[PDB]
Amino acid sequence: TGEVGIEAISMCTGTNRKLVVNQGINFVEYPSFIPGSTKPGGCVRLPSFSLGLEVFAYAHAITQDDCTSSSTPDYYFSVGRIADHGTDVPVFETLAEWFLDDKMNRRSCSVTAAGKGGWLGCSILVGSFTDELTSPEVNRISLSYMDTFGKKKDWLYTGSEVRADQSWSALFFSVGSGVVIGDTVYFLVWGGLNHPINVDAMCRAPGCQSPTQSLCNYAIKPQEWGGNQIVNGILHFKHDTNEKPTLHVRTLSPDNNWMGAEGRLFHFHNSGKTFIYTRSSTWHTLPQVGILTLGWPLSVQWVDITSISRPGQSPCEYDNRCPHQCVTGVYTDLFPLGVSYEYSVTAYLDQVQSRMNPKIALVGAQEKIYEKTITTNTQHADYTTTSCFAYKLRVWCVSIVEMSPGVITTRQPVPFLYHLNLGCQDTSTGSLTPL
Amino acid sequence: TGEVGIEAISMCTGTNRKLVVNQGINFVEYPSFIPGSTKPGGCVRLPSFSLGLEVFAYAHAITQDDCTSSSTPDYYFSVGRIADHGTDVPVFETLAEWFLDDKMNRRSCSVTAAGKGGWLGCSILVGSFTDELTSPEVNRISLSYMDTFGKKKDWLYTGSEVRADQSWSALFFSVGSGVVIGDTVYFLVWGGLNHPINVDAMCRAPGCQSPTQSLCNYAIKPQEWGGNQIVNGILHFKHDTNEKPTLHVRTLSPDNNWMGAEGRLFHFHNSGKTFIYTRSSTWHTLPQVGILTLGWPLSVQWVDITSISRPGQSPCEYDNRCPHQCVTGVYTDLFPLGVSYEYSVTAYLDQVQSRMNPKIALVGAQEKIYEKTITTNTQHADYTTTSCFAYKLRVWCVSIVEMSPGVITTRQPVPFLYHLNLGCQDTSTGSLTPL
């Protein structure tokens, strides 16, 4: 197993060069590494998946509701490896598992594969998330470590232990995975600020002639949540499997971001590039994807993608381009396949307002390159997260999709595994050069 | 972990004594040990589950159809243990897994937990099963062993290697689990005889005013299958994890059985009792349960149970009592809770012809003692297999139910786990004595 050569994919651009999908996607049949639920009713949701240099880490929440309440979830947390069983199909071997059923009310957890194990970052909530956003005291968070030998750590933090550049009223992990760079673990987080940063919101609106700056400013201060600025941040700590890690939080200024939201970090060691995705929760319904600079302060070079969107409640439905005051949308991340996020693959929901019609799609900046319907166009589905890797000189992707209905639950994540057969096509002649 | 004390449960009978369920069944939420499928449109079915003295063994078939075709399945096979994680809820810990995607066309497999490992018995078919039943050469069978370290054995047998008391045209494993007694592994098998045993069919029809012996004789030689006598048998061998075991088959005489069918063996080491269940595939829609004597020849002391039945096509639908010529029904085994099968627990389908309304039920000979609807009464479901055991001085049962529809498949087995809170009620006053 290795990382995708996104530099080589980026070179497949220019005159009489077109990135294409040689062969239709075919989903592999294998025993799923995502456990099902055993209690009638309820919901399995919020999958988090990280593929590291040595292991993968996975987690999801199990609730006894219809995926909408804030009842106390149980969490499943596992660490495994991509194994060699003598064929071209990668094999997901689970090595250590942890059923976190302690009723601590861990919320919005993300995983990060680090070395021979994984980190699980969660928010501990006592009440509702709106109550947490209003109250000036920040919620507690937990960090759990598990390696392939079954060694486990579980650390709890109050806000007074977190070295933050700002005073947050609430701190939630991003659901999507974080990354490790060298010896440091990085998580994307989001939450509310006690004292707003006095700058104008970003107001980056491709396809809107005159975006109203005032509407952009109100969008990041939803009144239904107490009117605080909702921001993203980066939580990082030096990887430590013995001592309690020392946590640092940096805030992404609202002039370089849309409303703070769930999202994901990606990192490629060969090119050194770090990428960021965030959920399109407001008026900006196009993908929010960029190159992240982990400096002081943080800065994101955002990349305009217009080929796809996500379902949302009107006026912030699929493909809406102009600012409004709305909170809707869905997490459907895009795995970067180019050094500038110009190519990516994703499981997205091709629907205007309803959450249905999930499709795998390879997309460029302007248009979709290839797409495949997962089941039917009336299929209900919700959150999706996609990860790609090199296995025996081929690009493989796993797209974990919250499919609805589950067998006995409202939702159930399914890990779709497929060879992504990319080729560079000379459009003057039709001849292909495989990647 | 230990076997249920069915001797103590049997004593809860007689004057002013009534076996009761103290508290309604409650389904436990835990990470399922049964993997889901990852390829849209398939089918996961035929679960086999065996809980032994040290380990459990599990297997199911994955097909790319609607569970009705005879396409070549992939098989999942796992070995694990009931673990103690410091709570009263038993924990199913998977220790070794084997994805048998070898395209060998293994059919109708059963598992048996044996020592620190498990045995998987399968039939190797070249064509359809009806062609196999007619053809005088018996199909090949395979025996696979896997231990908790993942070390694997895979043995192939032709008919000339099997020491059988009769000439079988076809030999299928029972889907339901076998048992190990001492040093010998026992599997229930069913199939066709080349030359029928010249005896009258059993014709045990509780609730039938005039059972016609001739119709009973026609029932075990269905013409749609080539008209051979369909029988059950016992396949056994000395447990050997190094050399190829030597197989022996004994036939159960047709005067001591209904039509040969899928089924299951149970064994309790404390009482030395061996029990048998077979699927009610023909006119006799009442449970087929008895005490098995492993002598030469085999004999079963059948037990009349009239409280429950199974859905089937008319004239052999739910609760039919009179002999007919039909092949229908469904596998829904009953785990014995008394030394004479007078008490048992099962997941059964409460419906006349359709396969729906699965319910957990504790039953006696004449009446149901307690029952619980798993989800709703419009829920589709098919095969079910139930196993009960003692965990920390309480009776726990796992009922694996083919629930329909799955998340992306036609069927998906779900292992429902529940405390079976039995009590002996003194009926003059209501006072209880816990078991």
Coordinates of N, CA, C and O in Angstrom, one line a residue, chain A residues 26-44 62-64 74 76 94 97-99 101 374-375 379 403-409 412 414-417, chain B residues 26-44 62-64 74 76 87 94 97 99 101 374-375 379 403-409 412 414-417:
Chain A
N26 N -16.3 -1.0 -11.0 CA -16.9 -2.3 -10.6 C -16.7 -2.5 -9.1 O -15.5 -2.4 -8.7
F27 N -17.7 -2.7 -8.4 CA -17.7 -2.8 -6.9 C -17.3 -4.2 -6.5 O -17.9 -5.2 -7.0
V28 N -16.3 -4.3 -5.7 CA -15.8 -5.6 -5.3 C -16.6 -6.2 -4.1 O -17.0 -5.4 -3.2
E29 N -16.9 -7.5 -4.2 CA -17.5 -8.2 -3.1 C -16.5 -8.7 -2.1 O -15.6 -9.5 -2.5
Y30 N -16.6 -8.3 -0.8 CA -15.7 -8.8 0.2 C -16.4 -8.6 1.6 O -17.4 -7.8 1.7
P31 N -15.9 -9.3 2.6 CA -16.5 -9.1 3.9 C -16.2 -7.7 4.5 O -15.1 -7.3 4.7
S32 N -17.3 -6.9 4.7 CA -17.2 -5.5 5.1 C -16.4 -5.4 6.4 O -16.7 -6.2 7.4
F33 N -15.5 -4.4 6.5 CA -14.9 -4.1 7.8 C -15.7 -3.2 8.7 O -15.2 -2.8 9.8
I34 N -16.9 -2.8 8.2 CA -17.8 -1.9 9.0 C -18.8 -2.8 9.6 O -19.6 -3.4 8.9
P35 N -18.9 -2.9 11.0 CA -19.8 -3.8 11.6 C -21.2 -3.2 11.5 O -21.5 -2.0 11.5
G36 N -22.2 -4.2 11.3 CA -23.6 -3.8 11.4 C -24.1 -3.7 12.8 O -23.5 -4.0 13.8
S37 N -25.3 -3.2 13.0 CA -26.0 -3.0 14.2 C -26.8 -4.2 14.6 O -27.2 -5.0 13.7
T38 N -27.1 -4.4 15.8 CA -27.8 -5.6 16.3 C -29.1 -5.3 17.0 O -29.8 -6.2 17.5
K39 N -29.5 -4.0 17.2 CA -30.7 -3.7 18.0 C -31.7 -3.0 17.0 O -31.4 -2.0 16.4
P40 N -32.9 -3.6 16.9 CA -33.9 -3.0 16.0 C -34.2 -1.6 16.3 O -34.3 -1.2 17.5
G41 N -34.3 -0.8 15.3 CA -34.4 0.6 15.4 C -33.1 1.2 15.6 O -32.0 0.5 15.7
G42 N -33.0 2.5 15.6 CA -31.7 3.2 15.7 C -31.0 3.5 14.4 O -31.6 3.4 13.3
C43 N -29.7 3.8 14.5 CA -29.0 4.4 13.4 C -27.5 4.2 13.6 O -27.0 4.3 14.7
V44 N -26.8 3.9 12.5 CA -25.4 3.8 12.4 C -25.0 4.9 11.4 O -25.4 4.9 10.3
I62 N -23.2 4.8 16.9 CA -24.4 4.0 16.9 C -25.4 4.6 17.9 O -25.1 4.7 19.1
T63 N -26.5 5.1 17.4 CA -27.6 5.7 18.2 C -28.9 5.0 18.1 O -29.1 4.2 17.2
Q64 N -29.7 5.1 19.2 CA -31.0 4.5 19.2 C -32.1 5.6 18.9 O -32.9 5.9 19.7
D74 N -23.3 5.2 21.2 CA -22.1 4.3 21.3 C -21.2 4.4 20.1 O -21.7 4.7 19.0
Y76 N -18.1 2.8 17.7 CA -17.2 1.7 17.3 C -15.9 2.2 16.8 O -16.0 3.2 15.9
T94 N -8.9 -6.1 9.9 CA -9.1 -5.5 11.2 C -8.2 -6.1 12.3 O -8.3 -7.4 12.4
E97 N -10.1 -3.7 17.9 CA -11.5 -3.1 17.9 C -11.8 -2.6 19.3 O -11.3 -3.1 20.3
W98 N -12.6 -1.6 19.4 CA -13.0 -1.0 20.7 C -14.4 -0.5 20.6 O -14.7 0.3 19.7
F99 N -15.3 -1.1 21.4 CA -16.7 -0.7 21.5 C -16.8 0.3 22.6 O -16.8 -0.1 23.8
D101 N -18.9 2.1 24.6 CA -20.3 2.1 25.1 C -20.4 2.7 26.5 O -21.3 2.3 27.3
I374 N -24.7 4.2 -7.7 CA -24.3 3.2 -6.8 C -25.3 2.0 -6.8 O -25.0 0.9 -7.0
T375 N -26.6 2.4 -6.6 CA -27.7 1.4 -6.7 C -28.7 2.0 -7.7 O -28.5 1.8 -8.9
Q379 N -32.5 5.7 -4.5 CA -31.8 5.2 -3.3 C -31.6 6.4 -2.3 O -31.0 7.4 -2.7
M403 N -26.0 4.5 3.7 CA -27.1 4.0 2.9 C -28.4 4.0 3.7 O -28.3 3.5 4.9
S404 N -29.5 4.3 3.2 CA -30.7 4.4 3.9 C -31.8 3.7 3.1 O -32.0 4.1 1.9
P405 N -32.7 2.8 3.6 CA -32.6 2.3 5.0 C -31.6 1.2 5.2 O -31.1 0.6 4.3
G406 N -31.1 1.1 6.4 CA -30.3 -0.1 6.8 C -31.2 -1.3 6.9 O -32.4 -1.2 6.8
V407 N -30.6 -2.4 7.3 CA -31.4 -3.7 7.4 C -32.4 -3.6 8.6 O -33.5 -4.0 8.6
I408 N -31.9 -3.0 9.8 CA -32.8 -2.8 10.9 C -32.6 -1.4 11.5 O -33.1 -1.1 12.5
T409 N -31.9 -0.5 10.7 CA -31.6 0.8 11.2 C -32.0 1.8 10.1 O -32.2 1.5 8.9
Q412 N -26.9 3.0 7.5 CA -25.9 2.0 7.7 C -24.8 2.3 6.7 O -25.0 2.4 5.5
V414 N -21.7 1.7 4.3 CA -21.3 0.6 3.4 C -20.0 1.0 2.8 O -19.9 2.1 2.2
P415 N -18.9 0.2 2.9 CA -17.6 0.6 2.2 C -17.5 0.0 0.8 O -17.1 -1.1 0.6
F416 N -17.8 0.8 -0.2 CA -17.7 0.4 -1.6 C -16.2 0.5 -2.0 O -15.6 1.6 -1.9
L417 N -15.7 -0.6 -2.5 CA -14.3 -0.7 -2.9 C -14.2 -0.9 -4.4 O -14.9 -1.8 -4.9
Chain B
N26 N -35.1 -8.0 25.7 CA -34.6 -6.7 25.2 C -33.3 -7.0 24.4 O -32.4 -7.8 24.8
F27 N -33.3 -6.5 23.2 CA -32.2 -6.8 22.3 C -31.0 -5.9 22.6 O -31.2 -4.6 22.7
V28 N -29.8 -6.5 22.7 CA -28.6 -5.7 23.0 C -28.0 -5.1 21.8 O -28.0 -5.7 20.7
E29 N -27.5 -3.9 21.9 CA -26.8 -3.2 20.9 C -25.3 -3.5 21.0 O -24.7 -3.3 22.1
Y30 N -24.7 -4.1 20.0 CA -23.2 -4.4 20.0 C -22.8 -4.5 18.6 O -23.6 -4.6 17.6
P31 N -21.5 -4.4 18.3 CA -21.0 -4.6 16.9 C -21.1 -6.0 16.5 O -20.5 -7.0 17.0
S32 N -21.9 -6.2 15.4 CA -22.2 -7.5 14.9 C -21.0 -8.3 14.5 O -20.1 -7.7 13.8
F33 N -20.9 -9.6 14.8 CA -19.8 -10.4 14.3 C -20.1 -11.0 12.9 O -19.2 -11.7 12.4
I34 N -21.2 -10.7 12.3 CA -21.6 -11.2 11.0 C -21.3 -10.0 10.0 O -22.0 -9.0 10.1
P35 N -20.3 -10.2 9.1 CA -20.0 -9.1 8.2 C -21.1 -8.9 7.2 O -21.8 -9.8 6.7
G36 N -21.2 -7.6 6.8 CA -22.1 -7.2 5.7 C -21.4 -7.4 4.4 O -20.2 -7.7 4.3
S37 N -22.2 -7.3 3.3 CA -21.7 -7.4 2.0 C -21.4 -6.0 1.4 O -21.9 -5.0 2.0
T38 N -20.6 -5.9 0.4 CA -20.2 -4.6 -0.1 C -20.5 -4.4 -1.6 O -20.2 -3.4 -2.1
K39 N -21.2 -5.4 -2.2 CA -21.5 -5.3 -3.6 C -23.0 -5.2 -3.8 O -23.7 -6.1 -3.4
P40 N -23.5 -4.1 -4.4 CA -24.9 -4.0 -4.6 C -25.6 -5.1 -5.4 O -25.0 -5.6 -6.4
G41 N -26.8 -5.5 -5.0 CA -27.6 -6.4 -5.6 C -27.4 -7.9 -5.2 O -28.2 -8.8 -5.7
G42 N -26.5 -8.2 -4.4 CA -26.2 -9.5 -4.0 C -27.2 -10.1 -2.9 O -28.3 -9.6 -2.8
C43 N -26.7 -11.1 -2.2 CA -27.6 -11.8 -1.2 C -26.6 -12.4 -0.2 O -25.6 -13.0 -0.6
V44 N -26.9 -12.3 1.0 CA -26.2 -13.0 2.1 C -27.2 -13.9 2.8 O -28.2 -13.4 3.3
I62 N -22.4 -15.8 0.3 CA -22.7 -14.5 -0.4 C -22.8 -14.9 -1.9 O -21.9 -15.4 -2.5
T63 N -24.0 -14.5 -2.4 CA -24.3 -14.8 -3.8 C -24.6 -13.4 -4.5 O -25.1 -12.5 -3.8
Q64 N -24.4 -13.4 -5.8 CA -24.8 -12.2 -6.6 C -26.1 -12.4 -7.3 O -26.2 -12.5 -8.6
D74 N -19.7 -17.1 -2.8 CA -18.5 -17.0 -1.9 C -18.9 -17.3 -0.5 O -20.1 -17.0 -0.1
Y76 N -18.1 -16.9 3.7 CA -17.4 -16.4 4.8 C -17.4 -17.3 5.9 O -18.4 -17.9 6.3
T87 N -18.5 -7.1 31.8 CA -20.0 -6.8 32.0 C -20.7 -8.1 31.9 O -20.1 -9.2 31.7
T94 N -14.3 -12.1 17.3 CA -13.8 -12.8 16.2 C -12.3 -13.0 16.2 O -11.6 -12.0 16.4
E97 N -10.6 -15.4 10.5 CA -11.5 -15.3 9.4 C -10.9 -15.8 8.1 O -9.7 -15.9 7.9
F99 N -12.1 -15.9 3.9 CA -13.0 -15.6 2.8 C -12.8 -16.6 1.7 O -11.8 -16.5 1.0
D101 N -13.5 -17.4 -1.4 CA -14.0 -16.9 -2.7 C -13.3 -17.7 -3.9 O -13.0 -17.1 -4.9
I374 N -39.8 -9.1 16.5 CA -38.4 -8.6 16.4 C -38.4 -7.1 15.9 O -37.8 -6.3 16.5
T375 N -39.1 -6.8 14.8 CA -39.3 -5.5 14.4 C -40.8 -5.2 14.2 O -41.5 -4.9 15.2
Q379 N -42.4 -7.2 8.5 CA -41.0 -7.4 8.2 C -40.8 -8.7 7.5 O -41.2 -9.8 8.0
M403 N -32.7 -11.2 7.7 CA -33.7 -10.1 7.5 C -33.7 -9.6 6.1 O -32.6 -9.6 5.4
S404 N -34.9 -9.2 5.6 CA -35.1 -8.8 4.2 C -35.9 -7.6 4.2 O -36.9 -7.5 4.9
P405 N -35.5 -6.6 3.4 CA -34.3 -6.4 2.6 C -33.1 -6.1 3.4 O -33.2 -5.5 4.5
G406 N -31.9 -6.4 2.9 CA -30.7 -5.9 3.5 C -30.5 -4.4 3.0 O -31.3 -3.8 2.4
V407 N -29.3 -3.9 3.4 CA -29.0 -2.5 3.0 C -28.8 -2.4 1.5 O -29.2 -1.4 0.9
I408 N -28.1 -3.3 1.0 CA -27.8 -3.3 -0.5 C -28.1 -4.7 -1.1 O -27.8 -5.0 -2.2
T409 N -28.6 -5.6 -0.3 CA -28.8 -7.0 -0.7 C -30.3 -7.4 -0.4 O -31.0 -6.7 0.3
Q412 N -29.9 -10.3 4.6 CA -28.7 -10.1 5.5 C -29.0 -10.7 6.8 O -29.9 -10.4 7.5
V414 N -28.8 -11.1 10.7 CA -28.6 -10.2 11.9 C -28.5 -11.1 13.1 O -29.4 -11.9 13.4
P415 N -27.5 -11.0 14.0 CA -27.4 -11.8 15.2 C -28.1 -11.1 16.4 O -27.4 -10.3 17.1
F416 N -29.3 -11.3 16.6 CA -30.0 -10.7 17.8 C -29.6 -11.4 19.0 O -29.7 -12.7 19.1
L417 N -29.2 -10.6 20.0 CA -28.6 -11.1 21.3 C -29.5 -10.6 22.4 O -29.8 -9.4 22.5

